[PDB]
A paper describes a structure:
The catalytic activity of [name]‐family tyrosine kinases is regulated by a tandem Src homology 2 module (tSH2 module). [name] and [name]‐70 share a common domain architecture, which includes two [name] domains connected by a helical linker, comprising the tSH2 module. [name] is recruited to these phosphorylated ITAMs through its tandem Src homology 2 module (tSH2 module) and is activated by ITAM binding. The binding of the tSH2 module to phosphorylated immunoreceptor tyrosine‐based activation motifs necessitates a conformational change, thereby relieving kinase inhibition and promoting activation.
We now present the crystal structure of the isolated, ITAM‐free tSH2 module of [name], which has not been previously reported. We find that, unlike the [name]‐70 tSH2 module, the ITAM‐free [name] tSH2 module adopts a conformation remarkably similar to that observed in the ITAM complex and distinct from the conformation observed in the autoinhibited kinase structure. 18 Additionally, while some of the crystal packing interfaces are similar to those of the ITAM‐bound complex, not all of the interfaces are the same, suggesting that similarity in conformation is not due to crystal packing. Overall, the tSH2 modules in our ITAM‐free structure represent a set of conformations in which the [name] domains have moved apart, with respect to the ITAM‐bound structure. The structure of the ITAM‐free [name] tSH2 module described here suggests that it favors the conformation corresponding to the ON state, unlike the tSH2 module of [name]‐70, which prefers the conformation of the OFF state. Conversely, we find that the C‐[name] of [name] is relatively rigid, even in the unbound state, and does not undergo a similar conformational rearrangement upon binding a peptide. 27 This observation, as well as our HDX‐MS data, indicate that our crystal structure reflects the solution structure of the [name] tSH2 module.
Numbering used by the authors: 9 to 122, 156 to 262
The structure:
Amino acid sequence: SANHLPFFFGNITREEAEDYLVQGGMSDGLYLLRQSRNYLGGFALSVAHGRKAHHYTIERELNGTYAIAGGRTHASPADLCHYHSQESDGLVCLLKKPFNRPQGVQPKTGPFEDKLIATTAHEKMPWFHGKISREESEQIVLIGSKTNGKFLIRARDNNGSYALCLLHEGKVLHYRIDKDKTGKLSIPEGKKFDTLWQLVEHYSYKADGLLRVLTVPCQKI
């Protein structure tokens, strides 16, 4: 699908997409497309309207079709833009001009690999150490070549519930990761994610409630 779209930027952050909106002209109806960072397989739509950027999450439905939350299904993300370019339907305005990728610029692929496969890809990742107790997690973090932001994720007493251990000025910080009814992982009062690696890539880029940003993953035993 949308890997060859001129306005598909990729796994860029929400802020970076807004910077491109100011580079494009911020004319109301200017839009671009990027990869969603907290909804697996879904997309995100960044539209500028009234001197502000507006973001809409294009979720991938169960049948393989993409649709906005509380909306009608579209074959591909391009079709959704084409539909919303002629019909407003719940958005701020109609999509007028796309902001094609500037020259030199390619789709940004992040450490997501730098449905089934995604859900069980964390087992082999360096920051995931599996099921360990709290005392074991702090020991393993405290005894290596340590540096601020060194972290790991462990499985809590529940299978499906995880816990984040982060190093901050000699102290191992413990953050709880809980599952909701939908099945989305989130830190208390934090943004919800579909997978753990999306939680890592978000928190390794911005503090967002944490005392510091995740940096280097602790190597697993």
